[PDB]
Nucleic acid binder design. Structure first.
Lengths: 66, 66
DNA sequence: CGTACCCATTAATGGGTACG
DNA sequence: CGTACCCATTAATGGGTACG
């Protein structure tokens, strides 16, 4: 699990997920469509080998990433 | 937002959600049906004024509830 | 309280193509 | 890379009734 392997946008989304935001809120916060957020989300999830956004959030708080 | 306001089983579910498990896994870990797991999740979210299981997970880690 | 359904609806997952 | 859509599916939400 290496956070540096993600792209800037992917880290943007991961940070917001770790703050408990649903895809629609992330889209409004970053001012991009929900479609795009979802693309970043699945890319991040595949690269980090995480089963869901909840794992992503928990993982972020455990390894104190960001 | 007091964790003590929850029932024992509700805290069991919260703990497992904060460990990033989906309802189906929680059901197997607790040896109860997914149906019952969903009822506890639903009760817990309303009582704790959380909007999703992700907020529940982040909250637990931020306030170190457990 | 905990159990386990019923209902409907929305959110999220995970594969694809496309194009500056 | 980042954008934004296409597809289909599962996971999750949030009301309800029921019963030991």
């Amino acid at each position: 699990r290496d956070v540096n392997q993600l792209t800037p946008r992917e880290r943007d989304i991961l940070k917001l997920i770790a703050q408990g935001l649903p895809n629609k809120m992330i889209a409004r916060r970053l001012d991009i469509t929900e479609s795009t957020v979802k693309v970043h989300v699945k890319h991040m999830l595949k690269k980090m080998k995480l089963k869901s956004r909840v794992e992503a959030a928990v993982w972020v708080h455990q390894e104190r990433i960001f």
